Structures are given as structure tokens and as C-alpha cells.
């Protein structure tokens, strides 16, 4: 895939991602907060089309993600991120994608997700999260 | 179970845990580093006894945990931590316990586990980890 790295910001205003019922997460883009300003992150797009767009708009700064979870598993047959769910102190957005394969979760008791980095080809290959107080 | 919280330290020198191959993790106890000196954490002991002791002794400071993983699953009607695996930069420790149920993993790209908290009844119910740069 094409490696992407947003780096680290002040928090998260919005997540734009797309997915396919049959395969996996495709596109990923974040609108971060940067010292009180929306920071529009670069849209990291799949190499292919066919996905269902989803928009996760947060009530920043009162609403914030408390748990990222999902599934990784094989697709044509690359290990990719098939599924994502974002749970905040207000609600649960997802699951989006196919909920099959190896489940993962990151719940946070103290701290904030402040960045994403990863790689996308046909599908979201992997990702990591910056965490901060 | 009985709740516990070690707090934060400088790093990890040793993990002493116990388990049984039919059930789950039983006891958990950590020798932290505190500013270049060992600090013996409290021993968090199951309500029951009979588990197989394990000592993980790390070559601190050059050796450190890069990933923690295992399984959560039901034992006698309780959700508990059924297995743990500790992966350092030098080798893997585990699995200990029983690898059945729902997998979880925390890989770390940048930063250090510097404390544990959780609860233990007959088995380790849950735990969380303090992370620091």
C-alpha cells in the first residue's frame, strides 16, 4: 500500500472512511483539531472504487473516542483491516466493514487519540494511533 | 474480584505471574524500575491457590516489552483473562494459560508500559496498562 502518517494533533473532529460489505475498509481521512482549528487531513484513498462512504462527525471537544476496535483478516489474500468501530463517550459508530477474522480493541482509560498512521492499497493494510494526554 | 492499581514507574524489570492450563491466569506481580532502582510491586493473588508460577526476568534497561497479548474467555460463568503473552524486543514469553476465547493485543510502536492495574478474583478479571515515553 501507500504508507500515510498524519502525525499528531490536538484531537479529532471528524472521521471519513468508506468500506465494502464483502471485503474491507477502503478509504480513510480525518479532520483533526489543531489548537482549536479544524485541520483537514489528507484523504488517504484506496487504489480501487466500490466502497460505501461513512462520515463520523464528533461533538468536539465534549465528545471523544474511548475505544477503537475491529477485525483484521485475509482479502485476496493480503492481511488487511476488514472492520472498524469507534466508540466515544457519547455513542458507538459502526461496525463498518466485515466483522470476520481476528478481533482487536484499544480501549483508553486516560488519554486521547491524536493521530493516525498506516498504509492503504486496495484496502486499509494496517494502522497505528498516536496517543497523548 | 479485588481491584488493584500499581501506579506508574520508570519501566519493568520482571513479571511474576501464575496460571493453570485448564482455567486462566491466577496471580500477577511486577518488579518495576524506579529511577534506576528495583521496586517490588504488591503481589496480586487469586482467592484460590494451586497455579503454576512463572518468572519473566528481563534484561533491563536494554530489554523491554513491545507487545502484550492473550485471550479473554468464560471460566465458571465469569469473563476472565485466560492467557497472556509478553513479547519483548529480544524474545517472547508465553503463552501462559489457555488460548481460547477472544484474542486481544497491544502492540507498542513508541513508548513503554510502566504500570498495571486490574482486578483478580479466582482469576485475573481484567487489567489495564500505564503507558509513557
Amino acid at each position: 500500500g501507500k504508507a500515510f502518517d498524519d502525525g499528531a494533533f490536538t484531537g479529532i473532529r471528524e472521521i471519513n472512511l468508506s468500506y465494502n460489505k464483502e471485503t474491507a475498509i477502503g478509504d480513510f481521512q480525518v479532520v483533526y483539531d489543531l489548537n482549536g482549528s479544524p485541520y483537514v487531513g489528507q484523504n488517504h484513498k484506496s487504489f480501487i472504487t466500490g466502497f460505501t462512504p461513512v462520515k463520523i462527525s464528533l461533538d468536539f471537544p465534549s465528545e471523544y473516542i474511548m475505544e477503537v476496535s475491529g477485525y483484521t483478516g485475509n482479502v485476496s489474500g493480503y492481511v488487511v483491516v476488514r472492520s472498524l468501530t469507534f466508540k466515544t463517550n457519547k455513542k458507538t459508530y459502526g461496525p463498518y466493514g466485515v466483522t470476520s477474522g481476528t478481533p482487536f480493541n484499544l480501549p483508553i482509560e486516560n488519554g486521547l487519540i491524536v493521530g493516525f498512521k498506516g498504509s492503504i492499497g486496495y484496502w486499509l493494510d494496517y494502522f497505528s494511533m498516536y496517543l497523548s494526554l | 474480584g479485588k481491584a488493584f492499581d500499581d501506579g506508574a514507574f520508570t519501566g519493568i524489570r520482571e513479571i511474576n505471574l501464575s496460571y493453570n492450563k485448564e482455567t486462566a491466569i491466577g496471580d500477577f506481580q511486577v518488579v518495576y524500575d524506579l529511577n534506576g532502582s528495583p521496586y517490588v510491586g504488591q503481589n496480586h493473588k487469586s482467592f484460590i491457590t494451586g497455579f503454576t508460577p512463572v518468572k519473566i526476568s528481563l534484561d533491563f534497561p536494554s530489554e523491554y516489552i513491545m507487545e502484550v497479548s492473550g485471550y479473554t474467555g468464560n471460566v465458571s460463568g465469569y469473563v476472565v483473562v485466560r492467557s497472556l503473552t509478553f513479547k519483548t524486543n529480544k524474545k517472547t514469553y508465553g503463552p501462559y494459560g489457555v488460548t481460547s476465547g477472544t484474542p486481544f493485543n497491544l502492540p507498542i510502536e513508541n513508548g513503554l508500559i510502566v504500570g498495571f492495574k486490574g482486578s483478580i478474583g479466582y482469576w485475573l478479571d481484567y487489567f489495564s496498562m500505564y503507558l509513557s515515553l
Binding site: 483484521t72 498516536y130 | 513508548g111
Partner: peptide
Amino acid sequence: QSGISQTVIVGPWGAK
């Protein structure tokens, strides 16, 4: 020892 600030990063989940 450089001028780039650093943060805790957890991950990756997915491929290698």
C-alpha cells in the same frame, strides 16, 4: 536528541 517532538504510538493492527 532531535527537534521533532514525540508521542506514544500504539499499533500497528493489520499486516506486518
